[PDB]
Design a protein around this ligand. Structure first.
Ligand SMILES: *[C@@H]1O[C@H](CO)[C@@H](O)[C@H](O)[C@H]1NC(C)=O
Ligand SMILES: *[C@@H]1O[C@H](CO)[C@@H](O)[C@H](O)[C@H]1NC(C)=O
Lengths: 257, 191, 182, 181
């Protein structure tokens, strides 16, 4: 009801087409220190940070106008602090991370402040320990001859099993160049053993192509699965390879007749 | 403050319409944007409306606003498979540019399968895997695919395969195991 | 020069390096409508009769102070860190209405040509600092971009009490006292 | 003395004849120098000093900035006039007229609003002009004004002096008398 207006001041002058946020996933354990970066749409003077626990919608954290914070009321506690030293790229710093900090941290920019555009976001997964981090094993299965003759179509199946935490990006590649048509990936992985909180995950995807395309031996198929784990510098004193962020794939070639 | 969004989940047949309703609390609110979010992706601004208009259409999308009642809705007509995603409404005020979102609504557009031909096939084993994989494919969207009730076997939920370039669409579910007596004759569901 | 019947400042935005600190207020025909207490984040209407009810979210001012803060840093570089010039403020003391001993009144201490906007204004009764019974306006704007501040003191005029207004500013070599008595 | 640096952003709305003619102006100021400004009458940003050239050229390019600045006369000025100014402009506070010697006579007109005011002096119903000195209008800062208007005079036993005051809040002029002691 009756609200007084005023002239909104604008950040004075002197990124890309969309707001960027890399990486998409960062896994660590309780107590470590984590930083999240955001490269804004070039020109945008306003920049926000929002947090999203799944099942829910984004919720406000901090709002920057140029170099300074215009609103930081959303910061959950004193362990969170953000900066944008140049009214451009912003960084959200979190100290002594806790399991409860796990969520997707979204970044959004606005030319002036009202119309906000979001970045892809970075999912932050904080574990008790990195003792249970495993990269996926990837296997690909060739088309049933029966399907080819009955439908004149050929379906390939990819299976990524054994990974933890449950966040991986699976994609299909054909003769270089990723493909999207004819692809179906389960929207959510299934626990290999539901009665456990330390369960590992499996995921599947299918790539369906015309029979003639699968029957051309010059065609090369690849199932690629990007996994996010520890990095090179991390400490690993376990009796197995260090589960570093990596890519695991499997191939197949179009079989003749 | 509070943006109430209903329904929490929505299933509608390809071609039919979908509606999401939201109720905001602060009457000072003057900007109402809507966002569409896809799995592992960020929310994308699809349309907005300001307190100075009651309706606004943009292709298959439409949004309405009732300042007095504090209700604003989203209309997606002639829904298409690509519309499946989670949607969020939000509110902003002249003085407070931060957005307060709704709880979200998971929208699922059931694909319409032109010529269903439900069949189960077995794929060849992989030289580097002990498992055997089965594919239940080309079935109607109503066809149910229950999860396995036997620990050693794994079955995924249904998934819609890309409209290709031949104007073709198809559902599929996958079952696998390394158990000795797996038969592909089992991905239980009838008629 | 602009000729108009009325002029409003729905946005007098101040921010200075010393502190650092800022101020946000709205003015109508030269009088203060309200200011936003930046520390408490609340809108403070000076006179609920000049508060022709329409709300003002305090957040609109904090947001505007951010831009101001950012913009100041930018301009400092653009102006090769040219420091501000301390103006010499002029003080004047006078009563609200005519003085009739044994009648409640109010002494007004006008501090004009203030710049930068940093000043101390206190009262003295027979040389003693009059702790309370005092009040103040915010830093009001002037078209030449300097400011003016007005301090008030409610009192009962008597034959045994003299008064003074003490103003401290970087544009003054020493505290300046303006005298007044019945 | 500590060195300082000051920034000022002024959002001004000028009104003439109710709301028929509205003008909005924003001024950015470094210390005491207005360097860039947007005047709804001009339509675009304008450098007022060399340091404002870059700013104006950049903002005038941005379609949002320019259009927003042009929409300010309505979104802010005309809006606030309806929400608060129209109501404030109804404020009326009658003046208090008191006379007192200091051979000078002083008509102390105090605590009124708005500023419009007419004050005349009279000796036996004939207006005094020579001998009359008035201060400029005085802003108390609390939404009221006052003004002192002196009259040089030499008192005779039967003379009646009158201070005549008119103000927009008065149905009829106020007249206070003063007779030779
Ligand atoms: C104002 O007073 C404080 C404390 O009395 C003092 O520290 C400060 O230097 C003074 N500033 C001015 C304007 O002289
Ligand atoms: C004031 O504006 C009205 C129209 O809004 C016009 O008819 C009138 O003549 C104007 N008066 C003056 C003195 O500008």
């Amino acid at each position: 009801n009756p609200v007084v207006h005023f002239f909104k001041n604008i950040v004075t002058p002197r990124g890309g087409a969309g707001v960027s946020q890399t990486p998409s996933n960062k896994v660590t354990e309780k107590g470590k220190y984590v930083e999240l970066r955001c490269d804004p749409i070039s020109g945008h003077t306003a920049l926000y940070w929002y947090r999203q626990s799944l099942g829910q919608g984004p919720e406000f954290l901090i709002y920057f106008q140029g170099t300074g914070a215009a609103d930081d009321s959303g910061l959950p506690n004193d362990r969170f602090f953000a900066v944008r030293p140049e009214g451009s790229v912003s960084t959200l710093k979190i100290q002594r991370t806790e399991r409860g900090d796990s969520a997707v941290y979204l970044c959004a920019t606005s030319a002036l402040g009202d119309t906000q555009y979001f970045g892809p976001g970075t999912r932050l997964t904080v574990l008790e320990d990195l003792k249970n981090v495993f990269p996926p094993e990837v296997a690909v299965f060739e088309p049933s001859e029966a399907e080819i003759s009955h439908t004149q179509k050929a379906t390939l199946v990819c299976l990524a099993t054994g990974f933890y935490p449950d966040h991986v990006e699976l994609s299909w590649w054909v003769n270089g160049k990723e493909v999207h048509s004819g692809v179906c990936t389960d929207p959510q992985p299934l626990k290999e053993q539901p009665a456990l909180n330390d369960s590992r995950y499996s995921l599947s995807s299918r790539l369906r192509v015309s029979a003639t395309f699968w029957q051309n031996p010059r065609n090369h198929f690849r199932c690629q699965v990007q996994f996010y784990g520890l990095s090179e510098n991390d400490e690993w004193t376990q009796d197995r390879a260090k589960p570093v962020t990596q890519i695991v794939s499997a191939e197949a070639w179009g079989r003749a007749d | 403050e509070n943006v109430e969004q209903h329904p929490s989940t929505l299933s509608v047949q390809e071609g039919d319409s979908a509606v999401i309703k939201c109720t905001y609390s602060d009457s000072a609110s003057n900007y109402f944007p809507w966002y569409k979010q896809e799995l592992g992706k960020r929310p994308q601004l699809i349309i907005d409306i300001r307190s100075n208009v009651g309706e606004k259409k943009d292709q298959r999308i439409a949004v309405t606003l009732n300042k007095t009642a504090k209700h604003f809705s989203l209309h997606i007509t002639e829904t298409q498979p690509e519309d499946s995603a989670v949607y969020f409404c939000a509110a902003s005020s002249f003085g407070n540019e931060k957005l307060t979102f709704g709880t979200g609504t998971r929208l699922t557009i059931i694909p319409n399968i032109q010529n269903p031909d439900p069949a189960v096939y077995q794929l060849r084993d992989s030289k580097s895997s002990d498992k055997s994989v089965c594919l239940f494919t080309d079935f109607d969207s109503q066809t149910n695919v229950s999860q396995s009730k036997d620990s050693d076997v794994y079955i995924t939920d249904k998934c819609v395969l890309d409209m290709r370039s031949m104007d073709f669409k198809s559902n599929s579910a996958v079952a696998w195991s390394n158990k000795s007596d797996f038969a592909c004759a089992n991905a239980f569901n009838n008629s | 020069d602009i000729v108009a019947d009325h002029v409003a400042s729905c946005g007098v935005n101040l921010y200075q390096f010393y502190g650092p600190s800022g101020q946000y207020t709205h003015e109508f025909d030269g009088d203060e409508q309200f200011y936003v207490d930046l520390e408490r984040k609340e809108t403070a209407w000076r006179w609920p009769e000049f508060s022709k009810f329409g709300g003002f979210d305090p957040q609109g001012a904090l947001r505007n102070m951010a831009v101001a803060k950012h913009n100041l840093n930018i301009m400092i570089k653009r102006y090769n860190s040219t420091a501000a010039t301390n103006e010499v403020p002029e003080v004047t003391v006078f009563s609200k209405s005519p003085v009739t001993l044994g009648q409640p009144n109010t002494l007004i201490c006008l501090v004009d040509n203030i710049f930068p906007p940093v000043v101390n204004i206190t009262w003295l009764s027979n040389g003693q600092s009059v702790t309370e019974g005092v009040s103040e306006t915010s830093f009001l704007s002037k078209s030449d971009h300097s400011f003016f501040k007005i301090s008030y003191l409610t009192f009962l005029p008597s034959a045994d009490e003299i008064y003074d207004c003490k103003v401290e500013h970087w544009g003054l070599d020493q505290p300046l006292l303006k005298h007044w008595e019945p | 003395s500590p060195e300082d640096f000051v920034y000022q952003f002024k959002g001004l709305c000028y009104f003439t004849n109710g709301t028929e003619r509205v003008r909005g102006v924003t001024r950015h100021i470094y210390n005491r120098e207005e360097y860039v400004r947007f005047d709804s009458d001009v339509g675009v940003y304008r450098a007022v000093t060399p340091q404002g050239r870059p700013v104006a050229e950049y903002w005038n390019s941005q379609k949002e900035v320019l259009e927003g600045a042009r929409a300010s006369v309505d979104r802010v000025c005309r809006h606030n006039y309806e929400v608060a100014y129209r109501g404030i402009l109804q404020r009326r506070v009658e003046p208090t007229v008191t006379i007192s010697p200091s051979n000078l006579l002083i008509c102390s007109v105090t605590d009124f609003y708005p500023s419009q005011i007419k004050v005349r002096w009279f000796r036996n119903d004939q207006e005094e002009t020579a001998g009359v000195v008035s201060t400029p209008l005085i802003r108390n800062g609390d939404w009221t004004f006052q003004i002192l208007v002196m009259l040089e005079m030499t008192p005779q036993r039967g003379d009646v002096y009158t201070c005549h005051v008119e103000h927009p809040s008065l149905q009829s002029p106020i007249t206070v008398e003063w007779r030779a002691q």
